Amino acid sequence: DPTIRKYVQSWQKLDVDEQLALFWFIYKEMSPAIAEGLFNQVKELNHEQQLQLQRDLIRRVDNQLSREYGSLGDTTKLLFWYLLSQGMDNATIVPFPADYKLSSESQELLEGIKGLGFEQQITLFRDYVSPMGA
């Protein structure tokens, strides 16, 4: 389980967009009210602002939405990130680009994360999204 922190640290060394790409592809290889609430504030924005929030959450930017995120529990935070992925498959959230290919480093992490067990993956994801926001 020290290997989980290494995934988190490796994940946190990538570019912000690279991080979001890795998170999205993992989603393709696979408290709710509070999450649905924050999720509504997201899809109520313009598609561009939807992108800037997710970046701002990874960058720990200090704004109102990041503060709300940062004030939630780990479970809610991860559920929020799930509803974002669902909102993207349903075209509710700004879509993901087809022509994006993962860096050599990212594809290594992904296959490495494909090796972990479902519960270690959940543990990984919770720790990755837990310190985001403000």
Output the smallest distance, CB 105 to ligand BCR, in A. 15
Sole window of 3-11, 66-74, 78-86, 108-116 interacting with ligand BCR (rule: CB under 6 A): 78-86
**By the 8 A CB rule, do 35 and 76 touch?**
yes
Contacts of 27 (CB under 8 A, 6+ apart): 82, 85
Phi, psi of 62 (to 5 degrees): -100, 95
Output the smallest distance, CB 24 to ligand BCR, in A. 4
Is residue 113 at the binding interface for ligand BCR, with CB under 6 A as the rule? no
Tokens for 132, please give them: 């985001």
- Letters for 28-47 (x = contact with ligand BCR by CB under 6 A, - = none) are --------------------
